[PDB]
């Protein structure tokens, strides 16, 4: 298995790695129907999303997708600082796929 | 998909956007039979609900409305300050699709 | 829908509101077969639980019941204050059916 | 219902009540396959466990002993004192059936 | 029942402790395809996972692995100082079985 997220990351296509080392700016999140979302940003102006669940995911990213929309809303409410973010580039806001936050 | 909370609101009918820049002064929580509904209230007058869910949700969103109220019950708790909300006004009280906060 | 918990209260039969104005001076929480509850009192001694799920309650009503014990148990740890209380007032000790938390 | 742990505690056979009134000293969570339980030691001496799920527990004791783990650990991140707990002296270490924490 | 973590960490084979006494320094987080797992680190150069559900886990193992995770974010994020680790040697990162926290 991997050992850092910027190795999980190059494991798949379409990604990269984006340097936070800040805490969250914004964070939205949404439930609307076919818009069950969360947003995010940060004071350098970048805007990410966990993706709405869809055909695109596998089965077991279900658990994962409310695992990382999870994430997201603690780390913004503690104002902890992320790290990395392994995003997907091809859609927008860039999608996130994994996270990393140290201390 | 959409960037921010105001442009994720206008692909709705019957929503609008409250700026609130504020924390929330009231929270309450029923658990009573055809009421499962979480109802806050700011400094303002203005209250808004979660509603019960029903019909008018598809399956995609009963998981959102239970991550919505887990939202606004932590928000509460802190005294997170809540920016935006897009709510539909075709309710009374007017009821959330989303949220946003900022720090 | 309702805006307040006493308009949401006054829905019901056999439920008065208690206004508290207090945080919770004790909380009790059984896995026991058959007992799984949570118990909570305030310094005035009075005493509410939240009931074993039963025929009693309807299908939404699951769910519900899951979330209200889990704000009781952050409202104890946080020691934030309850206003008020919508019960079931033909059960022993009382029964929760709504909860309310101003700031 | 009961009112209180004791007279929860004193419905089951092979109960007691043990009066720790302090904060968890250690805390021990296993995901190995048939060990998945929860086990938590006292300053003065005591060990208890939150038992692995199995026969011996009812349908409405599954989501309860997952609410159990759950209080076990937040109350031990935060140092919140325990008043009682109930347990089953019919196992070692001995198993949680009721906790009580109070202010 | 095992009464400690040692006790319980040899119950199984390739198994073995790491007694860090130390507080997570990194938290990796990834929802993508396949790599549904988190990855920590310690200031001593260590490197731990929770491995992605396999058909090597049980179905009593599934809500222990999601368990184990939600540990360890907030452990992490609380800098809260972990004692010791039960960990699979045969993976690598070596894939924790059992955690335990004091003080
Ligand atoms: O490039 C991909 N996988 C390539 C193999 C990587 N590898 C898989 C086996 O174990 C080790 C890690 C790969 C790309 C994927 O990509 C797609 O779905 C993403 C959401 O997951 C995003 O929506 C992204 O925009 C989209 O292009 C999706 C998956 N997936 O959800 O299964 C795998
Ligand atoms: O305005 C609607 N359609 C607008 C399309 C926006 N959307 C973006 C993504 O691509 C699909 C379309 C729209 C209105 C809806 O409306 C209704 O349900 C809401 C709760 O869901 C509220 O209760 C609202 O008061 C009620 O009128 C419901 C849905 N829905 O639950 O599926 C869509
Ligand atoms: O909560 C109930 N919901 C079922 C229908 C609810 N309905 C819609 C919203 O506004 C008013 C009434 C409901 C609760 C009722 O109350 C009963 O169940 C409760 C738990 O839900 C309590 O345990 C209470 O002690 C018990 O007498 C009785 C009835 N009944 O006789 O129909 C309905
Ligand atoms: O927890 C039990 N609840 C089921 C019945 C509850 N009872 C119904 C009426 O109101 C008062 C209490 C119950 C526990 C019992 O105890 C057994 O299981 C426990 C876990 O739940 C512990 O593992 C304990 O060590 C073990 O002996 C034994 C019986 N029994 O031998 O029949 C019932
Ligand atoms: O080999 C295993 N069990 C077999 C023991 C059966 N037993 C042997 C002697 O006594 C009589 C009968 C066995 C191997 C295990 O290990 C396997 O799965 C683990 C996660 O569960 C890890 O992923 C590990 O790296 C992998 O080797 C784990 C377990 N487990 O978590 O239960 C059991």
Known sequence: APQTITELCSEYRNTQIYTINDKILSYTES??????????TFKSGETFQVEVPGS???????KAIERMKDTLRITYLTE????????????????????????
């Open 31 to 40: 439930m609307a129907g076919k818009r069950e979302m969360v947003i995010i």
């Open 56 to 62: 695109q995911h596998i089965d077991s990213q279900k």
């Open 80 to 103: 902890t600082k992320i790290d990395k973010l392994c995003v997907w580039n091809n859609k927008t806001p860039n999608s996130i796929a994994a996270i990393s936050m140290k201390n």
